[PDB]
């Protein structure tokens, strides 16, 4: 309805170009600061003070990573960068701390001939890692590679208390170079599967969502998640506002969707995904 109004007028990008207006904008001077610059992949992408993930780390707690905390929806995520080879260790540790449940990489290591994110996790199940700087350790168990996502059941063992802990990580790999999905389909799904295995649900500490920036298609995924749980616990889909869940989320991290095509792909899969949960 909205959306057919916005789309046989194009008026899009305008809605974005407002959307990109509205938003919030809070300081991120932690962030900022020159004993975090190799703590950030992106100069355009920091996370704001408020809503910082602060590591339990007296050295330095800086991990550019934020909690979106959505209180009608009752979620929350944690929206972080694709780690940087400096920081598999942080990455780690915060997922130890905030006592995620899983991980969802909604990229490939390597987009656009270019290494996008580190590899922070092991790809042979013989061959663990050990971050020497958190003291964890990380270990493939399994994974089931399909053919437009892979999940992947890994172990983390906090070496200090020799206690361990399941993670799955949701990796979603085919999301395009350029664009976005042409159908919503495989992206719901990819969302529903992260969903059946609890990692979302209140039980666990908040999910930690990430891509290269970790706002454009991770904003993706928690805005059609959100949208669709709202539309849920009221089922009544007339009452949400994707424009105004977007911009709520905005309070906790910066540009959550990066471009007007994302925005418009958010619309169809919340559309699409509410003929079912709603």
Same mark, same amino acid.
């Given at each position: ?34 004993? @975090?610059?190799?703590? @950030?992949?992106? +100069? $355009?992408?920091?996370?704001? $003070?408020?809503? +910082? ?26 929206? /972080?960068?694709?780690? #940087? ?23 490939? *290591? ?23 700087? /958190? ?14 996502? /892979? ?6 063992? @906090? ?8 993670? #799955? ?19 719901? @799904? ?9 990692? #979302? ?6 999910? *930690? ?70």
């Amino acid at each position: 309805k909205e959306f057919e109004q916005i789309d046989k007028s194009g008026s899009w990008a305008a809605i974005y170009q407002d959307i990109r207006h509205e938003a919030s904008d809070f300081p991120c001077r932690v962030a900022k600061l020159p004993k @975090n610059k190799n703590r @950030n992949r992106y +100069r $355009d992408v920091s996370p704001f $003070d408020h809503s +910082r993930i602060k590591l339990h780390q007296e050295d330095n707690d800086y991990i550019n990573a934020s909690l979106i905390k959505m209180e009608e929806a009752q979620r929350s995520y944690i929206l /972080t960068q694709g780690p #940087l080879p400096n920081t598999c260790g942080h990455f780690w540790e915060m997922v130890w701390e905030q006592k995620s449940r899983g991980v969802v990489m909604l990229n490939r *290591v390597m987009e656009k001939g270019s290494l996008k994110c580190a590899q922070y996790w092991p790809q042979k199940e013989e061959k663990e890692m050990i971050f020497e700087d /958190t003291n964890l350790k990380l270990t493939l168990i399994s994974e089931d590679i399909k053919s437009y996502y /892979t999940v992947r059941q890994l172990e983390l063992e @906090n070496l200090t208390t020799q206690e361990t802990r399941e993670i #799955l990580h949701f990796h979603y790999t085919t999301w395009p170079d350029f664009g976005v999905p042409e159908s919503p389909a495989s992206f719901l @799904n990819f969302l529903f599967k992260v969903r059946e295995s609890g990692s #979302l649900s209140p039980e666990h500490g908040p999910v *930690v969502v990430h891509c290269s920036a970790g706002i454009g298609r991770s904003g993706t995924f928690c805005l059609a998640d959100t949208c669709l749980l709202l539309m849920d616990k009221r089922k009544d889909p007339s009452s949400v506002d994707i424009k105004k869940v977007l911009l709520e989320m905005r309070k906790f991290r910066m540009g959550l969707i990066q471009t007007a095509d994302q925005l418009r792909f958010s619309y169809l899969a919340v559309i699409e995904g509410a003929k079912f949960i709603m």
